[PDB]
Amino acid sequence: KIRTLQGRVVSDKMEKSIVVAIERFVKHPIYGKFIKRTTKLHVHDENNECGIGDVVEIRECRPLSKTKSWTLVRVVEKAV
Amino acid sequence: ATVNQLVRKPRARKVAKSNVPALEACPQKRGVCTRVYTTTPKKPNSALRKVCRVRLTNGFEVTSYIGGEGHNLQEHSVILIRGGRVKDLPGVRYHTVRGALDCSGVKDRKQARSKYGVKRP
Amino acid sequence: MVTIRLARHGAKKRPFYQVVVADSRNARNGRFIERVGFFNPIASEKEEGTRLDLDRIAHWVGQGATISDRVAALIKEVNKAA
Amino acid sequence: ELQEKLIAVNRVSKTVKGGRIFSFTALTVVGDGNGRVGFGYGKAREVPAAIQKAMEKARRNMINVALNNGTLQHPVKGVHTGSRVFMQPASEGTGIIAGGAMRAVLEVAGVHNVLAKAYGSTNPINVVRATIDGLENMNSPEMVAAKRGKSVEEILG
Amino acid sequence: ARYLGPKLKLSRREGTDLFLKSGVRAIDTKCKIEQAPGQHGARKPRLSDYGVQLREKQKVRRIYGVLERQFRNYYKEAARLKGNTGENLLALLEGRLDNVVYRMGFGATRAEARQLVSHKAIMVNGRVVNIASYQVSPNDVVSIREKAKKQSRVKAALELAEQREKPTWLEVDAGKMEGTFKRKPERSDLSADINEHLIVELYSK
Amino acid sequence: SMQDPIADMLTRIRNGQAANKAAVTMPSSKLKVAIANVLKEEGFIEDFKVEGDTKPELELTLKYFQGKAVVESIQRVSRPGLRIYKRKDELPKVMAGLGIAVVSTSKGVMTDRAARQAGLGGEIICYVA
RNA sequence: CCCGCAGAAGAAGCACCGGCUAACUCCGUGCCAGCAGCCGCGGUAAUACGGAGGGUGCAAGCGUUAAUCGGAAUUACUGGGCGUAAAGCGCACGCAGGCGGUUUGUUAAGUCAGAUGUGAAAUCCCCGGGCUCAACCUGGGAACUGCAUCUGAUACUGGCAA
RNA sequence: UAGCUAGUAGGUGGGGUAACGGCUCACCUAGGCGACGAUCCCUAGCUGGUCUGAGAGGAUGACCAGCCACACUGGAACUGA
Ligand SMILES: [Mg+2]
Ligand SMILES: [Mg+2]
Ligand SMILES: [Mg+2]
Ligand SMILES: [Mg+2]
Ligand SMILES: [Mg+2]
Ligand SMILES: [Mg+2]
Ligand SMILES: [Mg+2]
Ligand SMILES: [Mg+2]
Ligand SMILES: [Mg+2]
Ligand SMILES: [Mg+2]
Ligand SMILES: [Mg+2]
Ligand SMILES: [Mg+2]
Ligand SMILES: [Mg+2]
Ligand SMILES: [Mg+2]
Ligand SMILES: [Mg+2]
Ligand SMILES: [Mg+2]
Ligand SMILES: [Mg+2]
Ligand SMILES: [Mg+2]
Ligand SMILES: [Mg+2]
Ligand SMILES: [Mg+2]
Ligand SMILES: [Mg+2]
Ligand SMILES: [Mg+2]
Ligand SMILES: [Mg+2]
Ligand SMILES: [Mg+2]
Ligand SMILES: [Mg+2]
Ligand SMILES: [Mg+2]
Ligand SMILES: [Mg+2]
Ligand SMILES: [Mg+2]
Ligand SMILES: [Mg+2]
Ligand SMILES: [Mg+2]
Ligand SMILES: [Mg+2]
Ligand SMILES: [Mg+2]
Ligand SMILES: [Mg+2]
Ligand SMILES: [Mg+2]
Ligand SMILES: [Mg+2]
Ligand SMILES: [Mg+2]
Ligand SMILES: [Mg+2]
Ligand SMILES: [Mg+2]
Ligand SMILES: [Mg+2]
Ligand SMILES: [Mg+2]
Ligand SMILES: [Mg+2]
Ligand SMILES: [Mg+2]
Ligand SMILES: [Mg+2]
Ligand SMILES: [Mg+2]
Ligand SMILES: [Mg+2]
Ligand SMILES: [Mg+2]
Ligand SMILES: [Mg+2]
Ligand SMILES: [Mg+2]
Ligand SMILES: [Mg+2]
Ligand SMILES: [Mg+2]
Ligand SMILES: [Mg+2]
Ligand SMILES: [Mg+2]
Ligand SMILES: [Mg+2]
Ligand SMILES: [Mg+2]
Ligand SMILES: [Mg+2]
Ligand SMILES: [Mg+2]
Ligand SMILES: [Mg+2]
Ligand SMILES: [Mg+2]
Ligand SMILES: [Mg+2]
Ligand SMILES: [Mg+2]
Ligand SMILES: [Mg+2]
Ligand SMILES: [Mg+2]
Ligand SMILES: [Mg+2]
Ligand SMILES: [Mg+2]
Ligand SMILES: [Mg+2]
Ligand SMILES: [Mg+2]
């Protein structure tokens, strides 16, 4: 299948582009404790489809600006 | 302690300073020498200890101990310096290498002659 | 251009040649794709002297890789029916 | 079954109106070389009088140690005062790789090969009690089988 | 490379007979053995735990004629090899050519066996060998070459080997100076006096 | 405030053994019963119940062989401040394999000895010497 | 590399020696001259200083030096502490953050299990082999505790349920 | 060192590039980054490995091998795959 990544939106106030955080629950190399680490990506989308505070699926694709190589696939669970 | 505290601020290793700032991990270093003189040590000893201020090549100004009975150092005369505290003269933390350069060997030594820079009899 | 050639390993006056598939531009000892047997000129008549994996040679020479002066003769030395 | 030996001898002072009077303390550990150990302290005015006084206490103050062939059963701690003491079973090769005081007690006990390290303070008296605490503590598979009332093979295998 | 000093001085310090000054006569009684290491031989040594290890190490060194740097290398090899570390230390020492040449009887002393190896006399599997440290593998045939065979130093030295215990692991022809090293030596076969355990203690710390 | 319930269970056992106490009541749970069963099945605890409908109180009954207690020592490994998940080959063996390590694996809670043979790893809950 | 020449012939130091740490005495000197890695040695009977012998330890190297790790559980994840030894903020409230009682259902992020990829070759590690032997050299093996990728296991932890 | 950033962050019109794209214009939107440490400051080639350690680690990056960078200093483009 296509190698997508789930993630919650941080902001969408840029016209046809969305910044999305990807929470990843990796463990600490030394101390062994599980940390909640973040990965803020820039992502493309046609129109202002997705708002602030909602889960989104994202695909790796062609680099369509300075940053912002990732692109939207679909929305799952809209904003509250 | 507390595994979360350590994630937030890890264990800082104690960066222990070097005893001998001769710099760049150097075995020995040349010195032009100024003021050769006699100094008294700390409490239980009592003596007239032979010592000289060493103007090192890199820029430092230190005191080095003149180990052995008698010496040829005076006013100037270029000498070589090795690491090693005397543990009596407070301040002095280097040793002159006897034999090398203008610093000659000790006169009439037999036992232990690499220390104190003397050839075979 | 990929080429099958010796690598020259081992001590002074005691060479040992790792026949190897490498690029033309890269060095003798340096980069390669995969080593393919060896050669020892100071072996003499004993158990082992020279070994050369002929199956991997078909993958490279069949495609488009040259064989050097020394390695071409070791294919003659190992023979097809002798 | 003697296998007695001395760990440490240490002179100690009292202080009285006249001046100071010195005595000596011994520290001897004895064992049969087959699962009995016993430290004895003892103290006397003269040095050789102390070691006899120590050895006599050591013989009486003996502890049994259930050990496998010529080694320990399982890795074992044994704290006492300021000495931590850890020691591991180890295999049929090797020897007693442990510190002095901690290895006098081990060799006369009859353990032929173990790993061992004295953490904390390494006071010869307290490390010897630290080991013997750990060796007394050390339970065998026959003890553990009977304690739970299951089976010697079902636990082990 | 070698000791080349007073050799029977080494036996008095160590106490026991080291087979350094063994030679033609059987027993010496010619040094005040045991009670005269040096000027201060009557001084009873207190002798610590590090002492007894180092006295044991130097004894095994001075018997076999090996130096600390080479002797340490045997320990490193011994630790990596299978079995027991102590048994391998001495099994490697006994496999030396100058030691096997001594055990065959081609040399009254081990220094004579070392020199006889070094002097192009000793030959094994049809190949001449000069190295005293040569590790003699199982199933071999050490021998003397035809030029140096039946010279005056070897014939007198072979008659000494009849008084000796004679190892079970190796065999000697005696007529044509031809030896045969068969198996590796076992602990129980040789010595029964020099302790290995204490020499394993010295190098593990 | 009562963050780890499982560690609290293992203290009531350890402290109950120290007092030479016969029984040990506590608030029950799914995982409490799973662990307490694994302890019973090998033979540290001698029987247990889960008496109650609305507010269930799981009580254990601690074993004693001599004057000494049966549980020599017992400690939480995978506490909530630091979870410890071990792989099949990397599973521990407590006391060189004569004490057990309770380990929550994907086919229910079980001993480390059972987890090796079953062919899977998991969250190591406690060591029981 | 293989044979012939001669004749022990051309070929041994240098640390150390009060304890730690394998190894003793005589002189000279007298808190002076000097040793000192740590403790510490000398004030007229120095085992520590200088000399000598005597020893001990290494030896084609030996000491000193600088440099890293070790011992140091003396930054402690494995593996330390905080009443009096260094160390509980003067005491509260509290957002972010860390952690969270108990019971079913569902996802599988964590976790676990297998899957294929791949971790360049070298060294490092075993079974071998060629240097007269080793050192070196080299053939194969595992190792390369990797990181990704589909498939499941759902106890535990998280997500979402009521 | 706690705030930094105006081709700065996007979108399109044009433009270039072997090719994706503020790589470069013209406009349009006024954002983007940062306590999961931006910015600034000091130091530094990176890795396979090496060294030490029981191992975790700590140190390290001479020698062989891969990658990057640089060529009297600072620019610039040409010629060609
Ligand atoms: Mg994935
Ligand atoms: Mg993972
Ligand atoms: Mg770009
Ligand atoms: Mg002296
Ligand atoms: Mg040829
Ligand atoms: Mg030919
Ligand atoms: Mg060509
Ligand atoms: Mg008095
Ligand atoms: Mg301490
Ligand atoms: Mg040598
Ligand atoms: Mg002594
Ligand atoms: Mg052989
Ligand atoms: Mg002749
Ligand atoms: Mg070691
Ligand atoms: Mg697994
Ligand atoms: Mg002739
Ligand atoms: Mg001749
Ligand atoms: Mg001393
Ligand atoms: Mg003493
Ligand atoms: Mg001594
Ligand atoms: Mg006299
Ligand atoms: Mg000295
Ligand atoms: Mg006298
Ligand atoms: Mg005197
Ligand atoms: Mg001498
Ligand atoms: Mg040396
Ligand atoms: Mg140093
Ligand atoms: Mg350290
Ligand atoms: Mg440490
Ligand atoms: Mg800790
Ligand atoms: Mg502390
Ligand atoms: Mg105070
Ligand atoms: Mg305080
Ligand atoms: Mg308070
Ligand atoms: Mg108050
Ligand atoms: Mg919160
Ligand atoms: Mg819960
Ligand atoms: Mg459920
Ligand atoms: Mg359903
Ligand atoms: Mg499912
Ligand atoms: Mg695979
Ligand atoms: Mg494959
Ligand atoms: Mg592979
Ligand atoms: Mg190496
Ligand atoms: Mg090599
Ligand atoms: Mg080999
Ligand atoms: Mg040769
Ligand atoms: Mg290979
Ligand atoms: Mg290889
Ligand atoms: Mg291969
Ligand atoms: Mg295979
Ligand atoms: Mg293979
Ligand atoms: Mg590799
Ligand atoms: Mg599915
Ligand atoms: Mg279900
Ligand atoms: Mg939460
Ligand atoms: Mg939530
Ligand atoms: Mg505006
Ligand atoms: Mg190591
Ligand atoms: Mg360590
Ligand atoms: Mg290593
Ligand atoms: Mg270079
Ligand atoms: Mg590379
Ligand atoms: Mg240049
Ligand atoms: Mg140029
Ligand atoms: Mg230029």
Curated annotation (Swiss-Prot), chain A:
Signal peptide: none annotated. It comes from the Bacteria. Pfam families: Ribosomal_S17. HAMAP family: Ribosomal_uS17_B. PANTHER family: 40S RIBOSOMAL PROTEIN S11 FAMILY MEMBER, SMALL RIBOSOMAL SUBUNIT PROTEIN US17M. One of the primary rRNA binding proteins, it binds specifically to the 5'-end of 16S ribosomal RNA. Part of the 30S ribosomal subunit. This is Small ribosomal subunit protein uS17. The lineage of its organism: Bacteria, Pseudomonadati, Pseudomonadota, Gammaproteobacteria, Enterobacterales.
Swiss-Prot record, chain D:
GO terms for molecular function: rRNA binding; structural constituent of ribosome. Residues 2-65 form the S5 DRBM domain. Keywords: Acetylation, Ribonucleoprotein, Ribosomal protein, RNA-binding, rRNA-binding. SUPFAM superfamilies: dsRNA-binding domain-like, Ribosomal protein S5 domain 2-like. GO terms for biological process: translation. GO terms for cellular component: small ribosomal subunit. The keyword Ribosomal protein applies. The keyword Amino-acid biosynthesis does not apply. Pfam families: Ribosomal_S5, Ribosomal_S5_C. InterPro entries: Ribosomal_Su5_D2-typ_SF, Ribosomal_uS5, Ribosomal_uS5_bac-type, Ribosomal_uS5_C, Ribosomal_uS5_N, Ribosomal_uS5_N_CS, Ribsml_uS5_D2-typ_fold_subgr. Part of the 30S ribosomal subunit. Contacts proteins S4 and S8. Belongs to the universal ribosomal protein uS5 family. With S4 and S12 plays an important role in translational accuracy. The N-terminal domain interacts with the head of the 30S subunit; the C-terminal domain interacts with the body and contacts protein S4. The interaction surface between S4 and S5 is involved in control of translational fidelity. This is Small ribosomal subunit protein uS5.
From Swiss-Prot, chain E:
It comes from Escherichia coli O45:K1 (strain S88 / ExPEC). SUPFAM superfamilies: Alpha-L RNA-binding motif. One of its GO terms (molecular function) is structural constituent of ribosome. Residues 95-155 form the S4 RNA-binding domain. One of the primary rRNA binding proteins, it binds directly to 16S rRNA where it nucleates assembly of the body of the 30S subunit. With S5 and S12 plays an important role in translational accuracy. Part of the 30S ribosomal subunit. Contacts protein S5. The interaction surface between S4 and S5 is involved in control of translational fidelity. The keyword rRNA-binding applies. CDD domains: S4. InterPro entries: Ribosomal_uS4 (IPR022801), Ribosomal_uS4_bac-type (IPR005709), Ribosomal_uS4_CS (IPR018079), Ribosomal_uS4_N (IPR001912), S4_RNA-bd (IPR002942), S4_RNA-bd_sf (IPR036986). GO terms for cellular component: small ribosomal subunit. The keyword Ribonucleoprotein applies. Belongs to the universal ribosomal protein uS4 family. Keywords: Ribonucleoprotein, Ribosomal protein, RNA-binding, rRNA-binding. The lineage of its organism: Bacteria, Pseudomonadati, Pseudomonadota, Gammaproteobacteria, Enterobacterales. This is Small ribosomal subunit protein uS4. One of its GO terms (biological process) is translation. Pfam families: Ribosomal_S4 (PF00163), S4 (PF01479).
From Swiss-Prot, chain F:
Signal peptide: none annotated. Pfam families: Ribosomal_S8. It comes from the Bacteria. Coiled coil: none annotated. The keyword NAD does not apply. The keyword RNA-binding applies. Transmembrane segments: none annotated. GO terms for cellular component: ribonucleoprotein complex; ribosome. GO terms for biological process: translation. Keywords: Ribonucleoprotein, Ribosomal protein, RNA-binding, rRNA-binding. InterPro entries: Ribosomal_uS8, Ribosomal_uS8_CS, Ribosomal_uS8_sf. One of the primary rRNA binding proteins, it binds directly to 16S rRNA central domain where it helps coordinate assembly of the platform of the 30S subunit. Part of the 30S ribosomal subunit. Contacts proteins S5 and S12. This is Small ribosomal subunit protein uS8.
